[PDB]
Design a protein around this ligand. Structure first.
Ligand SMILES: Nc1ncnc2c1ncn2[C@@H]1O[C@H](COP(=O)(O)OP(=O)(O)OP(O)(O)=S)[C@@H](O)[C@H]1O
Ligand SMILES: [Mg+2]
Lengths: 438, 54
């Protein structure tokens, strides 16, 4: 029937946030901080004042969401009175930020009615005579995303020039910095701090469990009457949220003590609403929550326990022997020779008490050994993983490490999973379970 | 290599089931023989089946 698909599409659109900007919801715990952003940004597109704020809050804490809600709320009327310059702190390095501002000043003033061209000096001067220099001007709203990379501990030239065209300019600017560091004012060089308006507004977090169930109530209820089922779907929702002993409130309660975040709940709820096929099926699927434990089991299906569960028998004996050898050493290192000199000893003690276990030769335990470093059960001795930036992953791509030039069975590996954590997770009905004690 | 063996050996007591059952039995033989060697990897079984078939 084409009656159920409208309800499902409306529910998933509310769950993604892709509504039109008149029924787009704002949760109650972030309605005060949306008022401050609305106050700041509404006295720069209208009153043409200039200032600079920094939004501090963790990841998925609704900073780009609130800012795009304002910039789509200040566009239904005052479309022609502002242009937006959005730039990240990841995809815009401090030399490629100038080309970003020049390309986004050029193509935005085109859509209203060549500054992109030249070298870096000519482009940086072409956008310093444009901004640093009854009628109404045009304001520029700068959106700096992850501003804690432009505030590096060397120069801070882009921040000095952007915060310097706040006091000392004729063009009204309003620059938003979304970051994640709580110690963001300690980053700034002491002459970029003096140009800064010092108005850093911290995003709100969830203080109560009532805020979370009110947020889920705001997200899943339906306001516009599109499908015939909505008159049930609201009420059958509230029966799950008012009763504090149901499954949905219990999953919200265990979300409040774990990762205290609404987008994890959104990614839980979305394949529940989208895999359902009928309205009664959706109703009993949100009654029982038959999917928030299928999905939540699958999210842990291979970390260090759901893929050790899928180990084979020789691989398990090799892992147990290697953890025994690392437990016996001082600092926790071993190699293939010290591991195979425990596999054959353990299996000879298995065949001593008794029908048996076939001892695989060291020509076939090499494949097992390579299959337990491609599942991350062993690391090397001091091998750091992925490097932090892109140059340190280049500086080491030209280095020829000593741990890869020595022969294979002498590389000093290191355990990912100690023998105590191996004792409790192997079932007690195993033929090696007694061998996890020491 | 099997469809020339059925005529090299003068085999007339065969049908398609009589080929697919020995194929599945060979695959189960490689599995119960070599699963403790490889692990749960389809790629390390595919090439063992490719080697030990003819
Ligand atoms: N412009 C947007 N339109 C619709 N939904 C959005 C938008 N921006 C973010 N969301 C959603 O809002 C939730 C989190 O919002 P975000 O703005 O990405 O959080 P955040 O503060 O931007 O994280 P950052 O930028 O890394 S600090 C997610 O469910 C996003 O899918
Ligand atoms: Mg952001």
């Amino acid at each position: 029937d084409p009656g159920f698909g409208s309800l499902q599409r409306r529910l998933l659109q509310q769950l993604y946030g892709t509504l039109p900007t008149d029924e787009k919801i704002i949760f109650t715990y972030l309605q005060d901080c949306q008022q401050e952003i609305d106050r700041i940004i509404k006295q720069s597109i209208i009153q043409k004042e200039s200032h600079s704020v920094i939004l501090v809050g963790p990841r998925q804490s609704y900073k780009t969401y609130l800012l795009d809600y304002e910039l789509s709320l200040l566009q239904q009327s005052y479309k022609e009175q502002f242009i937006t310059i959005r730039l990240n702190g990841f995809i815009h390095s401090e030399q490629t930020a100038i080309n970003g501002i020049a390309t986004q000043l050029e193509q935005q003033l085109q859509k209203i009615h060549t500054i992109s061209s030249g070298s870096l000096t000519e482009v940086f001067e072409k956008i310093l005579l444009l901004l640093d220099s009854s009628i109404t001007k045009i304001t520029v709203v700068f959106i700096f995303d992850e501003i804690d990379t432009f505030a590096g501990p060397v120069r801070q030239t882009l921040l000095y020039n952007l915060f310097d065209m706040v006091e000392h300019s004729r063009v009204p600017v309003c620059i938003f910095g979304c970051t994640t560091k709580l110690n963001i004012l300690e980053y700034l060089e002491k002459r970029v701090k003096s140009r800064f308006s010092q108005r850093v507004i911290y995003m709100p977090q969830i203080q109560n469990l009532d805020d979370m169930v009110d947020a889920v109530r705001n997200l899943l209820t339906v306001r516009s009457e599109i499908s015939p089922w909505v008159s049930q779907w609201n009420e059958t929702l509230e029966k799950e949220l008012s009763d504090p002993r149901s499954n949905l409130n219990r999953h919200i309660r265990m979300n409040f003590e774990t990762f205290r975040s609404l987008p994890t709940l959104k990614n839980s709820i979305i394949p529940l609403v989208a895999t359902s096929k009928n309205f009664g099926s959706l109703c009993t699927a949100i009654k029982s929550c038959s999917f928030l434990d299928i999905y939540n089991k699958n999210q842990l299906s291979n970390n260090l326990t759901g893929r050790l569960q899928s180990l084979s028998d020789l691989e398990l004996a090799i892992l147990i022997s290697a953890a025994r050898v690392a437990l016996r050493a001082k600092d926790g290192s071993f190699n293939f020779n010290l591991a195979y000199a425990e596999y054959e000893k353990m299996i000879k003690a298995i065949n001593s008490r008794i029908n048996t276990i076939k001892l695989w030769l060291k020509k076939d335990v090499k494949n097992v050994w390579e299959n337990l470093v491609q599942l991350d059960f062993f690391t090397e001795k001091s091998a750091v993983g992925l490097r932090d930036n892109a140059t340190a992953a280049f500086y080491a791509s030209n280095y020829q490490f000593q741990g890869t030039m020595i022969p294979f069975d002498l590389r000093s590996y290191q355990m990912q999973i100690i023998l105590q954590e191996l004792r409790r997770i192997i079932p007690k009905s195993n033929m090696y379970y007694s061998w996890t004690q020491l | 290599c099997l469809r020339k063996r059925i005529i090299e050996e003068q085999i007339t007591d065969c049908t398609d089931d009589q080929f697919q059952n020995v194929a599945a039995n060979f695959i189960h033989l490689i599995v119960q023989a070599f699963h403790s060697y490889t692990g749960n990897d389809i790629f390390a079984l595919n090439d063992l089946i490719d080697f030990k078939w003819p």
